[PDB]
Design a protein around this ligand. Structure first.
Ligand SMILES: *[C@@H]1O[C@H](CO)[C@@H](O[C@@H]2O[C@H](CO)[C@@H](O[C@@H]3O[C@H](CO)[C@@H](O)[C@H](O)[C@@H]3O)[C@H](O)[C@H]2NC(C)=O)[C@H](O)[C@H]1NC(C)=O
Ligand SMILES: *[C@@H]1O[C@H](CO)[C@@H](O[C@@H]2O[C@H](CO)[C@@H](O[C@@H]3O[C@H](CO)[C@@H](O)[C@H](O)[C@@H]3O)[C@H](O)[C@H]2NC(C)=O)[C@H](O)[C@H]1NC(C)=O
Ligand SMILES: *[C@@H]1O[C@H](CO)[C@@H](O[C@@H]2O[C@H](CO)[C@@H](O[C@@H]3O[C@H](CO)[C@@H](O)[C@H](O)[C@@H]3O)[C@H](O)[C@H]2NC(C)=O)[C@H](O)[C@H]1NC(C)=O
Ligand SMILES: *[C@@H]1O[C@H](CO)[C@@H](O[C@@H]2O[C@H](CO)[C@@H](O)[C@H](O)[C@H]2NC(C)=O)[C@H](O)[C@H]1NC(C)=O
Ligand SMILES: *[C@@H]1O[C@H](CO)[C@@H](O[C@@H]2O[C@H](CO)[C@@H](O)[C@H](O)[C@H]2NC(C)=O)[C@H](O)[C@H]1NC(C)=O
Ligand SMILES: *[C@@H]1O[C@H](CO)[C@@H](O[C@@H]2O[C@H](CO)[C@@H](O)[C@H](O)[C@H]2NC(C)=O)[C@H](O)[C@H]1NC(C)=O
Ligand SMILES: *[C@@H]1O[C@H](CO)[C@@H](O[C@@H]2O[C@H](CO)[C@@H](O)[C@H](O)[C@H]2NC(C)=O)[C@H](O)[C@H]1NC(C)=O
Ligand SMILES: *[C@@H]1O[C@H](CO)[C@@H](O)[C@H](O)[C@H]1NC(C)=O
Ligand SMILES: *[C@@H]1O[C@H](CO)[C@@H](O)[C@H](O)[C@H]1NC(C)=O
Ligand SMILES: *[C@@H]1O[C@H](CO)[C@@H](O)[C@H](O)[C@H]1NC(C)=O
Ligand SMILES: *[C@@H]1O[C@H](CO)[C@@H](O)[C@H](O)[C@H]1NC(C)=O
Ligand SMILES: *[C@@H]1O[C@H](CO)[C@@H](O)[C@H](O)[C@H]1NC(C)=O
Ligand SMILES: *[C@@H]1O[C@H](CO)[C@@H](O)[C@H](O)[C@H]1NC(C)=O
Ligand SMILES: *[C@@H]1O[C@H](CO)[C@@H](O)[C@H](O)[C@H]1NC(C)=O
Ligand SMILES: *[C@@H]1O[C@H](CO)[C@@H](O)[C@H](O)[C@H]1NC(C)=O
Lengths: 482, 484, 484
């Protein structure tokens, strides 16, 4: 009755979370947060990025001018979305270096086309095919010009086109490979054509190949597609004696943050910085497990499906040496007392705020939203290729393993640090109380002090308030101790 | 009067090991372990991976059907081992994009061949050569069909072969480059041949080169090798007016964990998950220094040859831990020494010993386990100058190794620092728990020992070590001795 | 005043530096150092690397022998510097795989040329052009030999050149593409030429392409450039029926630490291990923000422009101990005592704790990251032409590398600074505890980092505490009388 008990403690919860540290494989803490984004809504948000739904059209088909891709003329994009249902419906073609043409056009982000008055005197223009009907009429790629004989004559073409602008020009052109020699000589009078497209810095020559081919859309022939970039002040020169699928002009080729993505996710009316083929994902967490293919401001892809970051002290469901206090809801640390006036509880705001202030924004010190990716490498492959594809796969797998390691070590280190800093605040609160009490109390060993003098609620409050004067009670307290 | 001294201490060893921390360049600990695997047995274990010893055969020669590689027909592998002694002994050839063909066949992991009934009516088949003898008679690559004129005629070939299966087909074919014009017109009647192999998605045209070549195995000619992959529902279409080295069928091209490795190490009868060109290596350690070229579940290649991970506390060799550690303590990491009315004694503390040990066991397995399972990767050694693509392959690999070497360096320093800190922490916690027990009955002598101001025999000493010491029993006696 | 006050404290400075830790975005410390090199002199030091200023000549032009590059014949280099003002002034050409040829020659580091006597009987040699004037006379590339018909005849060339040396030979050769068909038949007699260059391990065939070209230096034609490497004991074989731009010999091709760099920085007379396009930079710091393109022993490129590494304790602006405040005015140590007794107040530094903290901070980062970054010929990292796939990969690899090293640098500085704060806070607490153990029952903790010593304790007595020789038993009777 002539003494008092003051216990120092911390809070506890009944439903703790296990996290991982350097010290413990699993340790239960009061609170944690997930660092790996692992789910997507399934929709690609049309804000803030300019999304272009390719629908049934690939970018190359929209580039060449497949009639069912006419709506894409001169359109621009931040992200072009190619659907797996896309198909070709014009004259059969193939693109040597399809991958690079697709990449650089996708990164350019525009299909702005400008016609140029090539002088094709001597030959017939605007060749059409039943295999490429546009609005029920035989037609051809909108951006290409199928040249053929004019009155049984195909004179040698030698056409020039300077680049007198301040920008690079992208020229798409082709070479026709007839199925038979009867086709070859009927279209182009010479028994074999030849196309040479050149600039002051390049030369590209194609010899057409007359030969049977597997029928595609009623046609036994095919077109090879090539591209040429003309720098400012340079000159495009097209020299041909047959089989030339001529350009009608140039595409602007820009540099910027545009790219292309293969996805079947629908485009929704929402706003999201990060786009994956699985759909848009939130970018609050530093890491994501949804897809290695991302566009925008995105969490970094890691192999882990979950990484829990401790946001509270160790959960331990007498003072803090024995146990935590589930009943303390207004603070992380606090006091419990037993004196002449009964029992009471009060939280310590100083130590609680110190622990919280260290834990808030903990992760914003090492990992921020510094991962803004636009056009990158391909990370999914449908064809066997070998060397270049091996390297692309190895680079991406090397990157992911390294960030997965970084993510693992970071969470373990930070969680070790969250435990230690919260353990530290508890000991500091205990030491502040001991130094206040001086020779008026003894450490009972369980996180509680035995105060050797009568100490009513105001006296206990003075200790919690930091205004306890040991000199006032030292005479009374030293008398009871010894 | 009658008092007792109780000292808190930790163990020490005479033969400590130097490790590195964040704090110290080198600090001696009681025990440490190596994290870098630096030696190999010298043998490639034939388990658990399916090893195919190429012996004197490269993979491409086994693919084409070099007669001395006939034993490799239709064989499969997880790891194909190419020896530096391999040689070619058939018709002289070269493969444009040899590297990619070798890679994709190696990654497929099988040489399963399927013959197909190509209709070569109009030409002679099964051309043979003195440069490619099989069973001591003129022959040719087993998987290729040397077509040439039939009775002074080589009609233009137009042969089709649809892919009506569920898988991609790999077709290997060739073009013959005769040494002279006499050779060209005698073999193929036309003055210049032409080979066009096409699919619905591809076209490959080759113009043969009539011209002399360095004499190789009695031949001044050569064959160019090409490959074509035919997707399901697609069709192989072959058009030739001479010089076609025709396919006899297709190879299955599978996807899986198969690869190829250049090594001269022998194949032994053992079990080992990790294979390097130097031989199999253990994969218990997280890092290895043997070879950046690995196959299987492997430690990560680092530039360091040794990384010692502390598995024990700081070593302070030979009362109380403030002064020194106790080599004489062999049954625990922490413990008590006392001097009382009954003499002197020593006893270890199980709680603090177990706390430190449990925190250290599996300490590195909390950050890096054997999640490094690699199979077919990029090439990492090169015998020829190539330029751009090889520059990139080298830069990629050197970037990876530097980053992992940095990771390994920082990890060991961090782990060792934390191992030091946690073991030192257990010592201070043990000393403090003892102080809390003694209350006003003892005083800190400053050297890790308490002066207990009352008679405290071995049972009393044991009660302190066991946590059952009641200070109130002796408080009256102790306070009388402390204060005069 | 029959008592004394002994305060334990640490120093403080008026001009602290903000650093970043795991705990705080900004915390002021007594001292810090910059880890990111962010500035350049603007000049490339001509030592210790052998620098070759390309002037107005690219490496490929110096290789082929453009007349205004004649001064570069047979020169060697550690680093070739291409200026953006370089230009070509000979016959118009293009190099298929220009990047690779530039790369492999730059890595070889020499233009040593050795003439060889090819037998070009039957054709005319040393064709010259108005497009390639040398000393105001029509001329040609110094290292190439333009062959054409000799009196209306171009016989088939079949010229051999064995490599009977112990080193590899690099052969540069070309194929001429006339602008018109009549040009083709006037120069060479055949309507179409053919060039086949072969060795025992390679074959290269070129079919010339007749077609108009943009007029360049009076010429509507062009030359394709190719290269061939002939291993020892191998043989170069050149077979042509027209359009061959023949070699005059071979280049020695070495392996070493040579590279090429695009820069407009001037070359100075100084010494610097690290070269960037912006100029030489010091390599004392582990990181640099100047340029991802480096040559030599260089700091690792990071995206950060500054990373400050704490080299001192927390700065706490200013008797009272360390609990309340730090001591501005302590200039001979990091930690120390302030005392107040009968003779007044005094201050003295503690050398043990000061040296302990300092020894732990010096070279702290060299324990984890040294100058293990020595790079020479690497990949290209800036691009003037659109290329697509391969350039996509080179950009992605470098961007991946920089982000990973930028992450490492950010985490390393935050970790190291947190540990520097913690180790210095610890040294302060250890000194305070060492003093508490010395005083025994003669003093009490006042809570502000100070002890109230309950006995008369002049300066010699205080010095004994600082010196570690204070005997508490001497004053215990006097002190206990005052406490209780
Ligand atoms: C070389 O051989 C190929 C393969 O046998 C020949 O191609 C075949 O040519 C015929 C007639 O041109 C094609 O017939 C057509 O088939 C389509 C299929 O739907 C049908 O709708 C048409 O009414 C027509 O009957 C046949 O499809 C085609 N086969 C392939 C695989 O493309 C080629 O003609 C030969 N070259 C010659 C004879 O010069
Ligand atoms: C173009 O020039 C090359 C090289 O000068 C000629 O190749 C050489 O051809 C002769 C045969 O005429 C080869 O000689 C033979 O050598 C074998 C084994 O070495 C020997 O057993 C025979 O009895 C015969 O003497 C010689 O090896 C070969 N040299 C090389 C480097 O391949 C080639 O014939 C010329 N082309 C034409 C169309 O003349
Ligand atoms: C195919 O068409 C092109 C384009 O017209 C022809 O190229 C042009 O050829 C003329 C005559 O050689 C070049 O003119 C020259 O210009 C220089 C300086 O400007 C001047 O000093 C000369 O006296 C002459 O006027 C013209 O530059 C050139 N155009 C280009 C873009 O290079 C080419 O000749 C034609 N080829 C055939 C086989 O018809
Ligand atoms: C396979 O391709 C060849 C290559 O063109 C075809 O041969 C051509 O046939 C016509 C018929 O008069 C000739 O004018 C061409 O010159 C031939 N080419 C050559 C190189 O001589 C061949 O016809 C094709 N396949 C079939 C079945 O005919
Ligand atoms: C490039 O254009 C030139 C100029 O029109 C072509 O040259 C003519 O070719 C025809 C047919 O071969 C000849 O009858 C003329 O005499 C040529 N004229 C001149 C001025 O040379 C040339 O054929 C074209 N080249 C290509 C590859 O198409
Ligand atoms: C602040 O820290 C820097 C770096 O730790 C100190 O600079 C070092 O000073 C010593 C002098 O003993 C030199 O030998 C080192 O070469 C210096 N290092 C560097 C990187 O400059 C500096 O002394 C500290 N400043 C103060 C006032 O203590
Ligand atoms: C390779 O060199 C041989 C000569 O060594 C060339 O063959 C001669 O070619 C001409 C015309 O093509 C014929 O008149 C001769 O009869 C040929 N000689 C022999 C021995 O065949 C051949 O053209 C060259 N090949 C090339 C340059 O591709
Ligand atoms: C627990 O941590 C999360 C993550 O920061 C936070 O949102 C929440 O407010 C914290 N407190 C709780 C759940 O009481
Ligand atoms: C186009 O070029 C031909 C070439 O013969 C020329 O006759 C004609 O005048 C040119 N026409 C125009 C509109 O430039
Ligand atoms: C996202 O899509 C990829 C392939 O499209 C799939 O492998 C992965 O499991 C998907 N993840 C989620 C969370 O939908
Ligand atoms: C040293 O540490 C290793 C690895 O943890 C352990 O296997 C070994 O038993 C230890 N040795 C001693 C003497 O403690
Ligand atoms: C092969 O095809 C040819 C086509 O010319 C046909 O005449 C012949 O009868 C066929 N024979 C066989 C055995 O397939
Ligand atoms: C392993 O073999 C490779 C290739 O011969 C060699 O570079 C490396 O030094 C060897 N290392 C060991 C540890 O055997
Ligand atoms: C050079 O070539 C001519 C004609 O091919 C030949 O007669 C002569 O012997 C050759 N000389 C040498 C040294 O090879
Ligand atoms: C170095 O030059 C590059 C341009 O090549 C520029 O982007 C960079 O900011 C420069 N850095 C410095 C430190 O001057």
């Amino acid at each position: 009755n002539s003494t008092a008990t003051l216990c120092l403690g911390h809070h506890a919860v009944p439903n703790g979370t296990l996290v991982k540290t350097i010290t413990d494989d699993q340790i239960e803490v009061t609170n944690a947060t997930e660092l790996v984004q692992s789910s997507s809504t399934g929709r690609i948000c049309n804000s803030p990025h300019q999304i272009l739904d390719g629908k049934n059209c690939t970018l190359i088909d929209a580039l060449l001018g497949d009639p069912h891709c006419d709506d894409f003329q001169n359109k621009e994009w931040d992200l072009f979305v190619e659907r797996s249902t896309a198909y070709s419906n014009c004259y059969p073609y193939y693109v040597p270096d399809y991958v690079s043409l697709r990449s650089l056009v996708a990164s350019s982000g525009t299909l702005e086309f400008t016609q140029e008055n090539f002088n094709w005197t001597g030959v017939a223009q605007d060749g059409s095919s039943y295999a490429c009907r546009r609005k029920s009429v035989n037609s051809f790629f909108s951006r290409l010009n199928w040249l053929y004989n004019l009155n049984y004559k195909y004179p040698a073409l030698n056409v020039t086109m300077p680049n007198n602008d301040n920008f690079d020009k992208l020229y798409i052109w082709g070479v026709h490979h007839p199925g038979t020699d009867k086709d070859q000589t009927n279209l182009y009078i010479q028994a074999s054509g030849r196309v040479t497209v050149s600039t002051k810095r390049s030369q590209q020559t194609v010899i057409p190949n007359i030969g049977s081919r597997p029928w595609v859309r009623g046609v036994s022939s095919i077109i090879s597609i090539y591209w040429t970039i003309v720098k400012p002040g340079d000159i495009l020169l097209i020299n041909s004696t047959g089989n030339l699928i001529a350009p009608r002009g140039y595409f602007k080729i820009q540099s910027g943050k545009s790219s292309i993505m293969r996805s079947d996710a629908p485009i929704g009316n929402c706003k999201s910085e990060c786009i994956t083929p699985n759909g848009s994902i939130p970018n609050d967490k530093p890491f994501q497990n949804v897809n290695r293919i991302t566009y925008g401001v995105c969490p970094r892809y890691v192999k882990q499906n979950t990484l829990k970051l401790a946001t509270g002290m160790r959960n331990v469901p007498a003072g803090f040496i024995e146990n935590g206090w589930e009943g303390m809801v207004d603070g992380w640390y606090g006091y419990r007392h037993q004196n002449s006036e009964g029992t009471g509880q009060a939280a310590d705001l100083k130590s609680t705020q110190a622990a919280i202030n260290q834990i808030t924004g903990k992760l914003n010190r090492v990992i921020k939203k510094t991962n803004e990716k636009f056009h990158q490498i391909e990370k999914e492959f449908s064809e066997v290729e070998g060397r270049i594809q091996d390297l692309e796969k190895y680079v991406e797998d090397t990157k992911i393993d390294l960030w997965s390691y970084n993510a693992e070590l970071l969470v373990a280190l930070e969680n070790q640090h969250t435990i230690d800093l919260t353990d530290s605040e508890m000991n500091k609160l205990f030491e502040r109380t001991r130094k206040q009490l001086r020779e008026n109390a003894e450490d009972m060993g369980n996180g509680c002090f035995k105060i050797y003098h009568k100490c009513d609620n105001t006296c206990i409050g003075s200790i919690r308030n930091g205004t306890y004067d040991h000199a006032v009670y030292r005479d009374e307290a030293l008398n009871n101790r010894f």
